[PDB]
Amino acid sequence: QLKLGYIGLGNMGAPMATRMTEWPGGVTVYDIRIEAMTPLAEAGATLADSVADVAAADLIHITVLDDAQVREVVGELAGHAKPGTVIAIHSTISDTTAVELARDLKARDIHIVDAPVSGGAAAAARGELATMVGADREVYERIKPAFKHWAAVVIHAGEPGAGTRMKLARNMLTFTSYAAACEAMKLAEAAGLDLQALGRVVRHTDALTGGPGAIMVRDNMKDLEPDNFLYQPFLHTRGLGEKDLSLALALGEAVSVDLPLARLAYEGLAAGLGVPH
Amino acid sequence: QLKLGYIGLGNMGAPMATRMTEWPGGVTVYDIRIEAMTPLAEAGATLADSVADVAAADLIHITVLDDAQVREVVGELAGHAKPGTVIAIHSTISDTTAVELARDLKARDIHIVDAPVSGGAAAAARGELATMVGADREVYERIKPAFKHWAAVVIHAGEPGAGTRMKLARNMLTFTSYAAACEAMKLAEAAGLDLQALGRVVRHTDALTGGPGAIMVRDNMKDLEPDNFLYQPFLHTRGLGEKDLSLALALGEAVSVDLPLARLAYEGLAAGLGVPHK
């Protein structure tokens, strides 16, 4: 089994690394803060002296602040990594950084992989993360078993860079819906409602229904045609969506609250669902 | 103990009314469509001959198509229901509709409650619905044990009309977030990504994190002071969000896709979170 390395033990790095102490190949960890590393030692991780020390691992994980730090760390590992070594980047980077680093290191058999994760420290600890991976198919196949130890969902997104691109689509939804949630709270408050109660309803019902992902049941964005079994149901949902959004927008005007995300959604929903008017 | 009535056995009414066959009070049902009635019959429900027949019950549930139909059913019930009867409306109505019927029926000492529900037919069959209830305090307390049988989450949103209004806020989020999902799907596809996989990741991770509701943990919409327990977490969320949104917007420019919901989210997120820029 693959011997693991981990560099960067921050709020996601530490728990993934902790989960990797349960991996029979074992994990060698590094971070500059003595306090990020002490608990991993207690969990049974081998503590490394330096980034170069971690380069002896077969599969080296990196979760650091930004692209600049990733390049710095990758550059240091590259001086020592043996041929066949995989380097997985889990923290936030531009997709071009993954393309670039993979491209520069391929000739020395050092395989760069961008493998952003979602969602949560707790899930990381339990090995229930989703990861979206950009890699050579051959490289993806060799590391999948290792990835499956800490991720419940492992997607091969495409070549290096594709992982990042899938993460950007996924997280654009996350943060746009957070903005939408705050808009819903502003409306609720102007209506004299308990916002914490609303929050409880939303969270309970999204656990029942699955959440925003419930509408993601199409394999392309072509407009739906009447012969499609999905057609009448999406037509139905469009009617519901347009009704409820117009009702909400009317409430917004009644209680003097601007609702620009709702307004945009109201205008665009039909076209987005593939059932335009 | 309360004897139950149910009018409208459609895709939400039927599973709700089916759950109510397990209530000790029993349920009496009516729908004009025979094929809607028969399943409820073989689940142990009593079958009414008419809407007027259903008016004998203590607590009468209504789930039908639209306002116009809600107004008619309650108008029909109003001439037959005994004083003290409660009528609970679960289908879509305007927020003024609930108030109007409440005022209309005060005469007969018939109580109106707007109790929209969320989310799903499966939840409805299992008695795990959420319901947001506009009601006078005394009638809320009378019916709460009944509601608890088919709803795992029962909110007393306020007086009549308040249920509707909480529902409007809740479903605004539902459909704005579906809009955003479709925009995300458009981006993923232009970038050459697999939509099936994107959906699997979304649904899996939202099971873990809780979804958009995870951010709805504030009493009011005031800005967070530095010692607020949510300050550093929300500030961190603002940082992550603005970075991912900006990257997403740049990717959208690169693959020639318009991302207007994302642009608006990017500009307003910080303010929405109560940690605006200084």
Side-chain angles (χ1 to χ4, degrees), chain B residues 41-64 66-79:
Chain B
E42 64 196 21
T46 306
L47 301 190
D49 293 323
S50 62
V51 173
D53 195 7
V54 180
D58 301 308
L59 174 56
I60 300 164
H61 299 274
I62 297 171
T63 303
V64 293
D66 56 31
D67 286 64
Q69 279 174 39
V70 169
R71 285 165 188 279
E72 182 157 56
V73 171
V74 316
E76 170 76 358
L77 290 170

PDB file of all heavy atoms in Angstrom, chain B residues 41-79, unseen atoms left out:
ATOM      1  N   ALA B  41     -59.085   4.420   1.013  1.00  0.00           N
ATOM      2  CA  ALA B  41     -60.064   3.468   1.532  1.00  0.00           C
ATOM      3  C   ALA B  41     -59.371   2.204   2.038  1.00  0.00           C
ATOM      4  O   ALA B  41     -59.634   1.752   3.154  1.00  0.00           O
ATOM      5  CB  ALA B  41     -61.093   3.118   0.462  1.00  0.00           C
ATOM      6  N   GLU B  42     -58.469   1.650   1.230  1.00  0.00           N
ATOM      7  CA  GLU B  42     -57.779   0.413   1.610  1.00  0.00           C
ATOM      8  C   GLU B  42     -56.585   0.630   2.549  1.00  0.00           C
ATOM      9  O   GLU B  42     -55.908  -0.326   2.924  1.00  0.00           O
ATOM     10  CB  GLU B  42     -57.397  -0.421   0.376  1.00  0.00           C
ATOM     11  CG  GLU B  42     -56.400   0.206  -0.592  1.00  0.00           C
ATOM     12  CD  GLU B  42     -56.375  -0.498  -1.949  1.00  0.00           C
ATOM     13  OE1 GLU B  42     -57.364  -1.185  -2.299  1.00  0.00           O
ATOM     14  OE2 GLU B  42     -55.363  -0.358  -2.670  1.00  0.00           O
ATOM     15  N   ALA B  43     -56.349   1.884   2.939  1.00  0.00           N
ATOM     16  CA  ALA B  43     -55.421   2.214   4.019  1.00  0.00           C
ATOM     17  C   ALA B  43     -56.151   2.386   5.358  1.00  0.00           C
ATOM     18  O   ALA B  43     -55.508   2.534   6.399  1.00  0.00           O
ATOM     19  CB  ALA B  43     -54.651   3.479   3.676  1.00  0.00           C
ATOM     20  N   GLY B  44     -57.485   2.378   5.325  1.00  0.00           N
ATOM     21  CA  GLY B  44     -58.308   2.454   6.538  1.00  0.00           C
ATOM     22  C   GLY B  44     -58.980   3.795   6.790  1.00  0.00           C
ATOM     23  O   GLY B  44     -59.510   4.029   7.879  1.00  0.00           O
ATOM     24  N   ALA B  45     -58.964   4.681   5.795  1.00  0.00           N
ATOM     25  CA  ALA B  45     -59.622   5.979   5.918  1.00  0.00           C
ATOM     26  C   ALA B  45     -61.120   5.820   5.677  1.00  0.00           C
ATOM     27  O   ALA B  45     -61.542   4.929   4.939  1.00  0.00           O
ATOM     28  CB  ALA B  45     -59.031   6.967   4.924  1.00  0.00           C
ATOM     29  N   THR B  46     -61.922   6.670   6.312  1.00  0.00           N
ATOM     30  CA  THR B  46     -63.350   6.737   6.010  1.00  0.00           C
ATOM     31  C   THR B  46     -63.531   7.638   4.796  1.00  0.00           C
ATOM     32  O   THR B  46     -62.851   8.655   4.665  1.00  0.00           O
ATOM     33  CB  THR B  46     -64.172   7.288   7.192  1.00  0.00           C
ATOM     34  OG1 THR B  46     -63.889   6.528   8.372  1.00  0.00           O
ATOM     35  CG2 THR B  46     -65.665   7.217   6.889  1.00  0.00           C
ATOM     36  N   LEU B  47     -64.441   7.256   3.905  1.00  0.00           N
ATOM     37  CA  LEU B  47     -64.654   7.991   2.663  1.00  0.00           C
ATOM     38  C   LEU B  47     -65.907   8.844   2.752  1.00  0.00           C
ATOM     39  O   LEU B  47     -67.013   8.323   2.908  1.00  0.00           O
ATOM     40  CB  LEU B  47     -64.764   7.026   1.480  1.00  0.00           C
ATOM     41  CG  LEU B  47     -63.558   6.117   1.222  1.00  0.00           C
ATOM     42  CD1 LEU B  47     -63.717   5.401  -0.108  1.00  0.00           C
ATOM     43  CD2 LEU B  47     -62.252   6.896   1.254  1.00  0.00           C
ATOM     44  N   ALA B  48     -65.726  10.160   2.658  1.00  0.00           N
ATOM     45  CA  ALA B  48     -66.848  11.092   2.666  1.00  0.00           C
ATOM     46  C   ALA B  48     -67.552  11.076   1.315  1.00  0.00           C
ATOM     47  O   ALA B  48     -66.955  10.734   0.292  1.00  0.00           O
ATOM     48  CB  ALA B  48     -66.372  12.499   2.999  1.00  0.00           C
ATOM     49  N   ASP B  49     -68.828  11.443   1.330  1.00  0.00           N
ATOM     50  CA  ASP B  49     -69.640  11.517   0.120  1.00  0.00           C
ATOM     51  C   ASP B  49     -69.512  12.889  -0.536  1.00  0.00           C
ATOM     52  O   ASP B  49     -69.823  13.051  -1.719  1.00  0.00           O
ATOM     53  CB  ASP B  49     -71.110  11.246   0.459  1.00  0.00           C
ATOM     54  CG  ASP B  49     -71.358   9.814   0.912  1.00  0.00           C
ATOM     55  OD1 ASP B  49     -70.717   8.889   0.365  1.00  0.00           O
ATOM     56  OD2 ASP B  49     -72.207   9.609   1.807  1.00  0.00           O
ATOM     57  N   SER B  50     -69.051  13.870   0.235  1.00  0.00           N
ATOM     58  CA  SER B  50     -69.004  15.256  -0.214  1.00  0.00           C
ATOM     59  C   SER B  50     -68.135  16.095   0.715  1.00  0.00           C
ATOM     60  O   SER B  50     -67.766  15.651   1.804  1.00  0.00           O
ATOM     61  CB  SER B  50     -70.420  15.844  -0.251  1.00  0.00           C
ATOM     62  OG  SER B  50     -71.008  15.846   1.039  1.00  0.00           O
ATOM     63  N   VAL B  51     -67.813  17.310   0.280  1.00  0.00           N
ATOM     64  CA  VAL B  51     -67.105  18.268   1.130  1.00  0.00           C
ATOM     65  C   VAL B  51     -67.941  18.614   2.368  1.00  0.00           C
ATOM     66  O   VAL B  51     -67.400  18.789   3.462  1.00  0.00           O
ATOM     67  CB  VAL B  51     -66.761  19.560   0.359  1.00  0.00           C
ATOM     68  CG1 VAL B  51     -66.170  20.609   1.295  1.00  0.00           C
ATOM     69  CG2 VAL B  51     -65.795  19.261  -0.783  1.00  0.00           C
ATOM     70  N   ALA B  52     -69.258  18.698   2.189  1.00  0.00           N
ATOM     71  CA  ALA B  52     -70.182  18.994   3.288  1.00  0.00           C
ATOM     72  C   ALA B  52     -70.178  17.892   4.348  1.00  0.00           C
ATOM     73  O   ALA B  52     -70.356  18.164   5.537  1.00  0.00           O
ATOM     74  CB  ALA B  52     -71.598  19.204   2.750  1.00  0.00           C
ATOM     75  N   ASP B  53     -69.981  16.652   3.904  1.00  0.00           N
ATOM     76  CA  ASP B  53     -69.873  15.502   4.800  1.00  0.00           C
ATOM     77  C   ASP B  53     -68.629  15.616   5.689  1.00  0.00           C
ATOM     78  O   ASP B  53     -68.681  15.326   6.887  1.00  0.00           O
ATOM     79  CB  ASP B  53     -69.817  14.205   3.976  1.00  0.00           C
ATOM     80  CG  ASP B  53     -70.071  12.955   4.807  1.00  0.00           C
ATOM     81  OD1 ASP B  53     -70.424  13.070   6.003  1.00  0.00           O
ATOM     82  OD2 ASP B  53     -69.920  11.843   4.253  1.00  0.00           O
ATOM     83  N   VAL B  54     -67.523  16.060   5.095  1.00  0.00           N
ATOM     84  CA  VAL B  54     -66.242  16.183   5.799  1.00  0.00           C
ATOM     85  C   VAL B  54     -66.302  17.214   6.933  1.00  0.00           C
ATOM     86  O   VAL B  54     -65.551  17.118   7.905  1.00  0.00           O
ATOM     87  CB  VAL B  54     -65.098  16.552   4.817  1.00  0.00           C
ATOM     88  CG1 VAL B  54     -63.771  16.688   5.551  1.00  0.00           C
ATOM     89  CG2 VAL B  54     -64.986  15.506   3.719  1.00  0.00           C
ATOM     90  N   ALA B  55     -67.216  18.179   6.816  1.00  0.00           N
ATOM     91  CA  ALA B  55     -67.372  19.247   7.811  1.00  0.00           C
ATOM     92  C   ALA B  55     -67.697  18.775   9.236  1.00  0.00           C
ATOM     93  O   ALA B  55     -67.590  19.559  10.177  1.00  0.00           O
ATOM     94  CB  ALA B  55     -68.429  20.243   7.345  1.00  0.00           C
ATOM     95  N   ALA B  56     -68.093  17.512   9.399  1.00  0.00           N
ATOM     96  CA  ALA B  56     -68.364  16.953  10.729  1.00  0.00           C
ATOM     97  C   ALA B  56     -67.105  16.820  11.599  1.00  0.00           C
ATOM     98  O   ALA B  56     -67.202  16.792  12.828  1.00  0.00           O
ATOM     99  CB  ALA B  56     -69.057  15.601  10.601  1.00  0.00           C
ATOM    100  N   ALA B  57     -65.935  16.740  10.966  1.00  0.00           N
ATOM    101  CA  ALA B  57     -64.671  16.531  11.682  1.00  0.00           C
ATOM    102  C   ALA B  57     -64.251  17.744  12.511  1.00  0.00           C
ATOM    103  O   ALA B  57     -64.681  18.868  12.251  1.00  0.00           O
ATOM    104  CB  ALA B  57     -63.563  16.166  10.700  1.00  0.00           C
ATOM    105  N   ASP B  58     -63.402  17.497  13.506  1.00  0.00           N
ATOM    106  CA  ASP B  58     -62.903  18.550  14.399  1.00  0.00           C
ATOM    107  C   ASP B  58     -61.790  19.370  13.753  1.00  0.00           C
ATOM    108  O   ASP B  58     -61.694  20.578  13.980  1.00  0.00           O
ATOM    109  CB  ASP B  58     -62.364  17.948  15.700  1.00  0.00           C
ATOM    110  CG  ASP B  58     -63.408  17.153  16.459  1.00  0.00           C
ATOM    111  OD1 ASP B  58     -64.508  17.689  16.709  1.00  0.00           O
ATOM    112  OD2 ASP B  58     -63.124  15.987  16.803  1.00  0.00           O
ATOM    113  N   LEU B  59     -60.935  18.702  12.981  1.00  0.00           N
ATOM    114  CA  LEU B  59     -59.795  19.345  12.329  1.00  0.00           C
ATOM    115  C   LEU B  59     -59.750  18.919  10.869  1.00  0.00           C
ATOM    116  O   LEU B  59     -59.505  17.752  10.564  1.00  0.00           O
ATOM    117  CB  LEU B  59     -58.491  18.973  13.041  1.00  0.00           C
ATOM    118  CG  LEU B  59     -57.170  19.449  12.423  1.00  0.00           C
ATOM    119  CD1 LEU B  59     -57.138  20.962  12.242  1.00  0.00           C
ATOM    120  CD2 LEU B  59     -56.002  18.988  13.275  1.00  0.00           C
ATOM    121  N   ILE B  60     -59.982  19.875   9.977  1.00  0.00           N
ATOM    122  CA  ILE B  60     -60.164  19.595   8.556  1.00  0.00           C
ATOM    123  C   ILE B  60     -58.986  20.140   7.767  1.00  0.00           C
ATOM    124  O   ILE B  60     -58.739  21.344   7.767  1.00  0.00           O
ATOM    125  CB  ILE B  60     -61.458  20.245   8.027  1.00  0.00           C
ATOM    126  CG1 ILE B  60     -62.675  19.707   8.783  1.00  0.00           C
ATOM    127  CG2 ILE B  60     -61.613  19.992   6.530  1.00  0.00           C
ATOM    128  CD1 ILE B  60     -63.914  20.550   8.605  1.00  0.00           C
ATOM    129  N   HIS B  61     -58.273  19.247   7.089  1.00  0.00           N
ATOM    130  CA  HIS B  61     -57.097  19.611   6.309  1.00  0.00           C
ATOM    131  C   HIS B  61     -57.469  19.819   4.842  1.00  0.00           C
ATOM    132  O   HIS B  61     -58.230  19.030   4.272  1.00  0.00           O
ATOM    133  CB  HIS B  61     -56.045  18.510   6.413  1.00  0.00           C
ATOM    134  CG  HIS B  61     -55.560  18.263   7.807  1.00  0.00           C
ATOM    135  ND1 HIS B  61     -54.529  18.981   8.375  1.00  0.00           N
ATOM    136  CD2 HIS B  61     -55.950  17.364   8.742  1.00  0.00           C
ATOM    137  CE1 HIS B  61     -54.312  18.542   9.602  1.00  0.00           C
ATOM    138  NE2 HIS B  61     -55.162  17.562   9.851  1.00  0.00           N
ATOM    139  N   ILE B  62     -56.930  20.874   4.232  1.00  0.00           N
ATOM    140  CA  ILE B  62     -57.205  21.182   2.826  1.00  0.00           C
ATOM    141  C   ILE B  62     -55.909  21.340   2.029  1.00  0.00           C
ATOM    142  O   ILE B  62     -55.077  22.193   2.343  1.00  0.00           O
ATOM    143  CB  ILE B  62     -58.038  22.475   2.686  1.00  0.00           C
ATOM    144  CG1 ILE B  62     -59.409  22.310   3.345  1.00  0.00           C
ATOM    145  CG2 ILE B  62     -58.216  22.849   1.212  1.00  0.00           C
ATOM    146  CD1 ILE B  62     -60.186  23.606   3.436  1.00  0.00           C
ATOM    147  N   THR B  63     -55.753  20.507   1.001  1.00  0.00           N
ATOM    148  CA  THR B  63     -54.648  20.611   0.051  1.00  0.00           C
ATOM    149  C   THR B  63     -55.207  20.494  -1.361  1.00  0.00           C
ATOM    150  O   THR B  63     -55.474  19.390  -1.836  1.00  0.00           O
ATOM    151  CB  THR B  63     -53.597  19.499   0.273  1.00  0.00           C
ATOM    152  OG1 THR B  63     -53.106  19.560   1.615  1.00  0.00           O
ATOM    153  CG2 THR B  63     -52.429  19.651  -0.700  1.00  0.00           C
ATOM    154  N   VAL B  64     -55.393  21.637  -2.020  1.00  0.00           N
ATOM    155  CA  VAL B  64     -55.946  21.679  -3.380  1.00  0.00           C
ATOM    156  C   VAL B  64     -55.081  22.576  -4.281  1.00  0.00           C
ATOM    157  O   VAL B  64     -53.997  22.997  -3.876  1.00  0.00           O
ATOM    158  CB  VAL B  64     -57.432  22.126  -3.368  1.00  0.00           C
ATOM    159  CG1 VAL B  64     -58.294  21.066  -2.693  1.00  0.00           C
ATOM    160  CG2 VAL B  64     -57.589  23.476  -2.675  1.00  0.00           C
ATOM    161  N   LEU B  65     -55.550  22.859  -5.495  1.00  0.00           N
ATOM    162  CA  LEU B  65     -54.697  23.431  -6.540  1.00  0.00           C
ATOM    163  C   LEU B  65     -54.238  24.869  -6.297  1.00  0.00           C
ATOM    164  O   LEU B  65     -53.057  25.177  -6.464  1.00  0.00           O
ATOM    165  CB  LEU B  65     -55.405  23.356  -7.897  1.00  0.00           C
ATOM    166  N   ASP B  66     -55.170  25.744  -5.913  1.00  0.00           N
ATOM    167  CA  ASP B  66     -54.918  27.191  -5.885  1.00  0.00           C
ATOM    168  C   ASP B  66     -55.858  27.936  -4.924  1.00  0.00           C
ATOM    169  O   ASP B  66     -56.738  27.320  -4.321  1.00  0.00           O
ATOM    170  CB  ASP B  66     -55.034  27.760  -7.311  1.00  0.00           C
ATOM    171  CG  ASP B  66     -56.386  27.460  -7.970  1.00  0.00           C
ATOM    172  OD1 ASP B  66     -57.413  27.368  -7.264  1.00  0.00           O
ATOM    173  OD2 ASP B  66     -56.420  27.331  -9.213  1.00  0.00           O
ATOM    174  N   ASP B  67     -55.666  29.253  -4.785  1.00  0.00           N
ATOM    175  CA  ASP B  67     -56.508  30.085  -3.902  1.00  0.00           C
ATOM    176  C   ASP B  67     -57.987  29.899  -4.173  1.00  0.00           C
ATOM    177  O   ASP B  67     -58.762  29.620  -3.257  1.00  0.00           O
ATOM    178  CB  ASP B  67     -56.214  31.580  -4.077  1.00  0.00           C
ATOM    179  CG  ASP B  67     -54.915  31.999  -3.449  1.00  0.00           C
ATOM    180  OD1 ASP B  67     -53.860  31.520  -3.914  1.00  0.00           O
ATOM    181  OD2 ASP B  67     -54.946  32.806  -2.492  1.00  0.00           O
ATOM    182  N   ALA B  68     -58.369  30.081  -5.435  1.00  0.00           N
ATOM    183  CA  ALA B  68     -59.773  30.038  -5.840  1.00  0.00           C
ATOM    184  C   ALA B  68     -60.463  28.794  -5.297  1.00  0.00           C
ATOM    185  O   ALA B  68     -61.568  28.876  -4.765  1.00  0.00           O
ATOM    186  CB  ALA B  68     -59.892  30.094  -7.357  1.00  0.00           C
ATOM    187  N   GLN B  69     -59.797  27.648  -5.424  1.00  0.00           N
ATOM    188  CA  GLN B  69     -60.337  26.377  -4.937  1.00  0.00           C
ATOM    189  C   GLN B  69     -60.344  26.285  -3.409  1.00  0.00           C
ATOM    190  O   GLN B  69     -61.268  25.706  -2.833  1.00  0.00           O
ATOM    191  CB  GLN B  69     -59.570  25.193  -5.543  1.00  0.00           C
ATOM    192  CG  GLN B  69     -60.033  24.826  -6.948  1.00  0.00           C
ATOM    193  CD  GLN B  69     -59.167  23.757  -7.603  1.00  0.00           C
ATOM    194  OE1 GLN B  69     -58.736  22.802  -6.953  1.00  0.00           O
ATOM    195  NE2 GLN B  69     -58.917  23.912  -8.901  1.00  0.00           N
ATOM    196  N   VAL B  70     -59.329  26.848  -2.754  1.00  0.00           N
ATOM    197  CA  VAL B  70     -59.305  26.894  -1.290  1.00  0.00           C
ATOM    198  C   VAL B  70     -60.501  27.693  -0.776  1.00  0.00           C
ATOM    199  O   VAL B  70     -61.232  27.230   0.099  1.00  0.00           O
ATOM    200  CB  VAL B  70     -57.995  27.505  -0.736  1.00  0.00           C
ATOM    201  CG1 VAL B  70     -58.118  27.772   0.761  1.00  0.00           C
ATOM    202  CG2 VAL B  70     -56.814  26.580  -1.018  1.00  0.00           C
ATOM    203  N   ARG B  71     -60.700  28.884  -1.340  1.00  0.00           N
ATOM    204  CA  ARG B  71     -61.841  29.729  -0.981  1.00  0.00           C
ATOM    205  C   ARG B  71     -63.177  28.998  -1.123  1.00  0.00           C
ATOM    206  O   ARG B  71     -64.051  29.133  -0.267  1.00  0.00           O
ATOM    207  CB  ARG B  71     -61.844  31.017  -1.817  1.00  0.00           C
ATOM    208  CG  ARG B  71     -60.800  32.027  -1.366  1.00  0.00           C
ATOM    209  CD  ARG B  71     -60.563  33.122  -2.391  1.00  0.00           C
ATOM    210  NE  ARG B  71     -59.429  33.965  -2.009  1.00  0.00           N
ATOM    211  CZ  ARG B  71     -59.479  34.969  -1.132  1.00  0.00           C
ATOM    212  NH1 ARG B  71     -60.618  35.293  -0.522  1.00  0.00           N
ATOM    213  NH2 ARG B  71     -58.377  35.661  -0.864  1.00  0.00           N
ATOM    214  N   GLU B  72     -63.328  28.212  -2.188  1.00  0.00           N
ATOM    215  CA  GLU B  72     -64.578  27.486  -2.425  1.00  0.00           C
ATOM    216  C   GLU B  72     -64.827  26.364  -1.417  1.00  0.00           C
ATOM    217  O   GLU B  72     -65.930  26.248  -0.888  1.00  0.00           O
ATOM    218  CB  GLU B  72     -64.627  26.917  -3.843  1.00  0.00           C
ATOM    219  CG  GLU B  72     -65.944  26.201  -4.145  1.00  0.00           C
ATOM    220  CD  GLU B  72     -66.244  26.123  -5.624  1.00  0.00           C
ATOM    221  OE1 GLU B  72     -65.392  25.592  -6.369  1.00  0.00           O
ATOM    222  OE2 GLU B  72     -67.327  26.595  -6.041  1.00  0.00           O
ATOM    223  N   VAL B  73     -63.817  25.535  -1.169  1.00  0.00           N
ATOM    224  CA  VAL B  73     -63.961  24.418  -0.234  1.00  0.00           C
ATOM    225  C   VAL B  73     -64.318  24.916   1.169  1.00  0.00           C
ATOM    226  O   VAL B  73     -65.241  24.393   1.794  1.00  0.00           O
ATOM    227  CB  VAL B  73     -62.688  23.538  -0.177  1.00  0.00           C
ATOM    228  CG1 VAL B  73     -62.776  22.522   0.956  1.00  0.00           C
ATOM    229  CG2 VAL B  73     -62.468  22.832  -1.512  1.00  0.00           C
ATOM    230  N   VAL B  74     -63.609  25.937   1.652  1.00  0.00           N
ATOM    231  CA  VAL B  74     -63.882  26.479   2.986  1.00  0.00           C
ATOM    232  C   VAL B  74     -65.266  27.132   3.021  1.00  0.00           C
ATOM    233  O   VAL B  74     -65.977  27.031   4.020  1.00  0.00           O
ATOM    234  CB  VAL B  74     -62.799  27.487   3.482  1.00  0.00           C
ATOM    235  CG1 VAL B  74     -61.392  26.966   3.198  1.00  0.00           C
ATOM    236  CG2 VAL B  74     -63.001  28.871   2.867  1.00  0.00           C
ATOM    237  N   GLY B  75     -65.644  27.790   1.925  1.00  0.00           N
ATOM    238  CA  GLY B  75     -66.987  28.351   1.775  1.00  0.00           C
ATOM    239  C   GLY B  75     -68.080  27.297   1.853  1.00  0.00           C
ATOM    240  O   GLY B  75     -69.150  27.546   2.403  1.00  0.00           O
ATOM    241  N   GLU B  76     -67.803  26.118   1.300  1.00  0.00           N
ATOM    242  CA  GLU B  76     -68.717  24.974   1.369  1.00  0.00           C
ATOM    243  C   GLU B  76     -68.731  24.380   2.781  1.00  0.00           C
ATOM    244  O   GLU B  76     -69.794  24.056   3.313  1.00  0.00           O
ATOM    245  CB  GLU B  76     -68.310  23.916   0.330  1.00  0.00           C
ATOM    246  CG  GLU B  76     -69.016  22.556   0.427  1.00  0.00           C
ATOM    247  CD  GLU B  76     -70.447  22.563  -0.091  1.00  0.00           C
ATOM    248  OE1 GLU B  76     -70.945  23.634  -0.496  1.00  0.00           O
ATOM    249  OE2 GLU B  76     -71.075  21.481  -0.096  1.00  0.00           O
ATOM    250  N   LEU B  77     -67.547  24.235   3.375  1.00  0.00           N
ATOM    251  CA  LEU B  77     -67.413  23.740   4.751  1.00  0.00           C
ATOM    252  C   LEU B  77     -68.064  24.663   5.789  1.00  0.00           C
ATOM    253  O   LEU B  77     -68.584  24.194   6.803  1.00  0.00           O
ATOM    254  CB  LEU B  77     -65.933  23.564   5.116  1.00  0.00           C
ATOM    255  CG  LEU B  77     -65.146  22.432   4.452  1.00  0.00           C
ATOM    256  CD1 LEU B  77     -63.660  22.576   4.764  1.00  0.00           C
ATOM    257  CD2 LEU B  77     -65.662  21.074   4.902  1.00  0.00           C
ATOM    258  N   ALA B  78     -68.026  25.970   5.528  1.00  0.00           N
ATOM    259  CA  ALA B  78     -68.460  26.985   6.497  1.00  0.00           C
ATOM    260  C   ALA B  78     -69.934  26.871   6.887  1.00  0.00           C
ATOM    261  O   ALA B  78     -70.309  27.228   8.006  1.00  0.00           O
ATOM    262  CB  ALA B  78     -68.166  28.385   5.961  1.00  0.00           C
ATOM    263  N   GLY B  79     -70.760  26.375   5.968  1.00  0.00           N
ATOM    264  CA  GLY B  79     -72.189  26.185   6.226  1.00  0.00           C
ATOM    265  C   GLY B  79     -72.549  24.889   6.940  1.00  0.00           C
ATOM    266  O   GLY B  79     -73.716  24.678   7.276  1.00  0.00           O
TER     267      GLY B  79
END
